[PDB]
Scaffold this active site. Structure first.
Site, short mmCIF file in Angstrom:
data_model
loop_
_atom_site.label_atom_id
_atom_site.label_comp_id
_atom_site.label_asym_id
_atom_site.label_seq_id
_atom_site.Cartn_x
_atom_site.Cartn_y
_atom_site.Cartn_z
N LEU A 37 0.83 -1.20 0.00
CA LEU A 37 0.00 0.00 0.00
C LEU A 37 0.87 1.25 0.00
CD1 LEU A 37 -2.92 -0.91 2.44
CD2 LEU A 37 -2.82 -1.09 -0.02
N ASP A 38 0.21 2.40 -0.13
CA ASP A 38 0.84 3.70 -0.19
C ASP A 38 0.62 4.46 1.11
OD1 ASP A 38 1.98 6.10 -0.86
OD2 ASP A 38 0.35 6.73 -2.20
N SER A 39 1.47 5.45 1.36
CA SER A 39 1.35 6.23 2.59
C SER A 39 -0.04 6.84 2.72
CB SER A 39 2.40 7.33 2.64
OG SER A 39 3.54 7.00 1.87
#
Ligand SMILES: CCCCCCCCCCCCCCCCCC(=O)OC[C@H](COP(=O)([O-])OCC[N+](C)(C)C)OC(=O)CCCCCCCCCCCCCCCCC
Ligand SMILES: CCCCCCCCCCCCCCCCCC(=O)OC[C@H](COP(=O)([O-])OCC[N+](C)(C)C)OC(=O)CCCCCCCCCCCCCCCCC
Ligand SMILES: CCCCCCCCCCCCCCCCCC(=O)OC[C@H](COP(=O)([O-])OCC[N+](C)(C)C)OC(=O)CCCCCCCCCCCCCCCCC
Ligand SMILES: CCCCCCCCCCCCCCCCCC(=O)OC[C@H](COP(=O)(O)OCCN)OC(=O)CCCCCCCCCCCCCCCCC
Ligand SMILES: CCCCCCCCCCCCO[C@@H]1O[C@H](CO)[C@@H](O[C@H]2O[C@H](CO)[C@@H](O)[C@H](O)[C@H]2O)[C@H](O)[C@H]1O
Ligand SMILES: C/C=C(/C)[C@H](O)[C@H](C)/C=C(C)/C=C/C/C(C)=C/Cc1[nH]c(OC)c(OC)c(=O)c1C
Ligand code: SF4
Ligand code: SF4
Ligand code: SF4
Lengths: 78, 156, 178, 115, 114
Positions: A37-39
């Protein structure tokens, strides 16, 4: 402080949340490394817990809840 | 035919009532709205043509765009126009409203109010003299006089 | 030097004569009756209205109205495509093209005024060295479409021929002030 | 019966003009026409939210004075009594306590609207 | 290469303000959609929020990220107070604009532009 009513829910939402694959999800899967996932995906997840447990999580705190466990641990630490 | 004749005179009857009661919306933007106030002033007394300013777009027949239309004000002008009950007419007054005017090349100006609403009459000038607007208003009554709604309904 | 508009506190004493005057002012609404009087006087004044379109508001020979292209008394166009009206136009309302004519004359093939950019400043009238472009006295030329307010050369020459009788007399009445 | 007739006739006219107004015109309904009016921009909130009443104390003091009208309206019949002294004394006192009640509220800044 | 900071002293202390702005924008989509009577879904609105935050994914100068955060708060405020209108909010969605093809051939057929 009730440590498995929490586990059922902290992982309940992660199942509903999209970009998480439920089958690969594990109660100790790293958000960034394993699931990938992304921040800005994590920011969405943490807010999901706010929907249930109904208590703000300071950004300083939420920038470490990198796998479902710490969540579970964090709330138990309520 | 007799019915087609009766429809014609009924058409003149309804037109006449709309010609004789034009209620412009109290609504002006810039310097062109000052000359619109002079047309209401004693010398021209638009009230004597049956022209009464009404504040609410629900009670207004005519929207006179009297000044510059900027991008910030463009959505609001359209909204009060939508809220005008039909039939409804727009008089575009002044270069700013007609086509941008002195600000045609400005980043913040709508290059003519007719990109936002349908316009019936264009009145040239910067500003048009109160008579020029009056000529335009009276040119809108003649446009209504040529309306043929009832007759066209008969031939449908 | 300055004056006080709303200063008057050089306080006097309220005499029984004056107190009864203040009360009559308040109880009898006297100043409000004075205002009713002023609007009653206006009712019997002649109204300032004029009977348009049968009566017209006064105008002067300088009045800046609709544009027009003029000719010489021989019927030759005055405009020599110098393009000074174009260089001055505050609104960039004039577009011009030119080329040598069939007889070699310097004349425009295009001459447009977008009357929706024009601010009717009259600057083109001042810049023209041969009185070719003028603002006539017409002000009653509202249209029913935007496109009719984009004047090309034919339209402007037609306005010139239409209005020349009156344009020439206004210049005759005003050129000495220029 | 007459007074019933004349008022139905009034109602039927008001109804009849209401029907003609709705079924005679040519109507073109769309969402942007039928939105509420607010000077050209969208409303920022419904109009059903609380609207503070800065004269509420005067509003309920109107009720108390409104019923004190109901006590003075029989006077036209009351000046027909033999007991004129009594009728008058009761009338004077009634109006005087309404006045004394009004003076107290006036001096207590009760007639002033709450800021 | 030394410069006065605006607010953040380096990119990490600035990303803290970014995520805090993204939170606020994320909480406000369901209200904007409800109050402005937009004809979109919350998921579609929130995706658009994410799309705008990723438009500036390459910025690294901390001062620049301060002024993007400053602007984004101004944009958030214009929406929460309903100073913007349907037209203004809906401009982010470019619904009337056909998008220019990004392939050489389509550009070549369409005109002189690169
Ligand atoms: C409700 C009562 C209805 C009675 C009024 C309707 C008659 C309207 C015509 C009128 O009175 O003025 C003459 C009007 C005046 O014409 P006008 O409106 O063009 O002239 C106005 C301009 N000045 C002031 C310069 C004259 O004549 C008409 O052009 C309209 C005639 C239509 C008549 C209606 C059809 C007959 C009825 C079926
Ligand atoms: C006070 C009362 C004043 C009325 C005086 C009598 C005049 C009545 C004329 C009709 C009223 C105007 C209605 C109208 O403008 O719509 C025209 C309509 C529109 O015609 P249409 O059917 O062609 O329009 C179709 C819809 N559009 C155009 C949008 C696609 O024509 C009528 O049907 C009116 C019928 C008139 C018959 C009289 C009774 C009508 C009730
Ligand atoms: C005075 C007005 C009364 C006559 C017009 C009544 C309108 C009406 O109900 O039309 C019949 C209705 C149609 O109503 P309508 O929607 O067309 O009413 C609009 C009236 N005009 C046409 C003038 C704009 O017929 C039906 O289909 C149902 C009956
Ligand atoms: C024998 C025994 C005798 C017994 C009887 C004695 C009777 C004496 C006469 C009393 C007359 C009382 C009339 C009412 C007068 C009145 O109340 O007016 C005062 C009122 C207050 O105005 P204010 O701004 O407050 O100025 C004074 C400061 N308090 O100011 C106003 O009222 C102004 C209201 C004006 C509103 C405009 C109305 C139009 C007026 C023009 C129409 C004229 C007809
Ligand atoms: C707490 C609030 C108090 C404030 C209000 C006080 C009000 C007091 C009012 C006192 C006035 C009464 O006034 C009084 O009127 C009556 C009748 O009207 C008069 O009475 C006279 O007339 C009546 C009939 O009308 C005769 O039958 C009687 O024999 C005769 O005396 C008195 O001579 C007068 O004194
Ligand atoms: C009450 C009814 C009537 C018939 C009145 O007689 C007249 C005709 C209506 C008036 C006064 C205004 C009509 C429209 C309008 C809203 C104008 C804008 C305006 N209005 C100004 O002041 C009032 C200005 O002041 C400097 C302006 O700059 C501008 C741009
Ligand atoms: S056309 Fe001229 S007078 Fe009219 S609003 Fe524009 S600048 Fe003012
Ligand atoms: S009057 Fe002014 S704005 Fe109009 S064409 Fe002449 S120079 Fe241009
Ligand atoms: S109208 Fe006058 S100023 Fe304009 S190009 Fe012709 S000669 Fe020159």
């Amino acid at each position: 402080l009730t440590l498995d009513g929490i586990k059922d829910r902290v992982l309940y939402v992660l199942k509903l949340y999209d970009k998480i694959d439920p089958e690969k999800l594990s109660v100790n899967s790293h958000f960034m490394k394993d699931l990938g996932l992304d921040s800005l995906d994590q920011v969405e997840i943490i807010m999901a817990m706010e929907d249930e447990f109904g208590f703000e999580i300071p950004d300083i705190d939420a920038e470490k809840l990198m796998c479902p466990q710490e969540i579970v641990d964090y709330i138990a630490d309520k | 035919s007799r019915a087609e004749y009766v429809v014609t005179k009924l058409d003149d009857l309804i037109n006449w009532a709309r010609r004789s009661s034009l209620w412009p919306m109290t609504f002006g933007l810039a310097c062109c709205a000052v000359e619109m106030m002079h047309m209401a002033a004693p010398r021209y007394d638009m009230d004597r043509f049956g022209v009464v300013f009404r504040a609410s777009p629900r009670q207004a027949d005519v929207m006179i765009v009297a000044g510059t239309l900027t991008n910030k004000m463009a959505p609001a002008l359209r909204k009060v126009y939508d809220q005008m009950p039909e039939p409804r007419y727009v008089v575009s007054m002044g270069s700013c409203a007609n086509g941008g005017g002195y600000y045609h090349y400005s980043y913040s100006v709508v290059r003519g109010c007719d990109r936002i609403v349908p316009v019936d009459i264009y009145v040239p000038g910067c500003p048009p003299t109160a008579e020029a607007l009056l000529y335009g208003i009276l040119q809108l009554q003649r446009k209504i006089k040529r309306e043929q709604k009832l007759k066209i309904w008969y031939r449908r | 030097t300055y004056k006080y508009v709303n200063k008057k506190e050089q306080e006097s004493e309220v005499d029984m004569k004056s107190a009864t005057d203040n009360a009559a002012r308040i109880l009898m609404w006297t100043e409000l009756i004075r205002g009713l009087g002023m609007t009653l006087s206006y009712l019997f004044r002649e109204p300032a209205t004029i009977n348009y379109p049968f009566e017209k508001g006064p105008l002067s020979p300088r009045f800046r109205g609709e544009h027009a292209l003029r000719r010489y008394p021989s019927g030759e166009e005055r405009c020599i495509a110098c393009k000074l009206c174009e260089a001055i136009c505050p609104a960039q309302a004039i577009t011009i093209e030119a080329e040598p004519r069939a007889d070699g004359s310097r004349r425009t093939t295009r001459y447009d005024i977008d009357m929706t950019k024009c601010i009717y400043c009259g600057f083109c009238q001042e810049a023209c060295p041969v009185d070719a472009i003028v603002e006539g006295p017409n002000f009653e030329f509202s249209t029913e479409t935007h496109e009719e307010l984009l004047y090309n050369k034919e339209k402007l020459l037609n306005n010139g021929d239409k209005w020349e009788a009156e344009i020439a007399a206004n210049i005759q009445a005003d050129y000495l002030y220029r | 019966m007459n007074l019933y007739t004349v008022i139905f006739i009034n109602i039927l006219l008001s109804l009849t003009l209401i029907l003609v107004a709705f079924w005679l015109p040519q109507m073109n309904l769309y969402s942007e026409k039928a939105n509420p009016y607010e000077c050209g921009f969208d409303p920022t909130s419904s109009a059903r939210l609380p609207f503070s009443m800065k004269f509420f104390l005067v509003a309920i003091t109107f009720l108390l004075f409104d019923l004190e009208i109901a006590l003075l309206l029989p006077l036209p019949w009351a000046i027909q009594t033999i007991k004129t002294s009594t009728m008058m004394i009761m009338a004077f006192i009634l109006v005087t306590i309404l006045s004394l009640g009004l003076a107290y509220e006036w001096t207590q800044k009760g007639l002033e609207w709450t800021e | 290469t030394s410069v006065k900071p605006i607010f953040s002293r380096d990119l990490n202390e600035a990303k803290r303000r970014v995520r805090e702005l993204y939170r606020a924008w994320y909480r406000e989509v369901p209200n904007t959609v409800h109050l402005m009577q937009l004809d979109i879904t919350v998921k579609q609105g929130r995706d658009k929020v994410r799309e705008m935050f990723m438009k500036n994914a390459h910025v690294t100068d901390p001062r620049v990220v301060d002024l993007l955060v400053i602007k984004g708060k101004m944009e958030l405020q214009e929406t929460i107070k309903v100073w913007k209108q349907r037209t203004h909010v809906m401009r982010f969605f470019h619904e009337t604009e056909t998008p220019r093809p990004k392939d050489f051939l389509s550009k070549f057929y369409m005109g002189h532009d690169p």
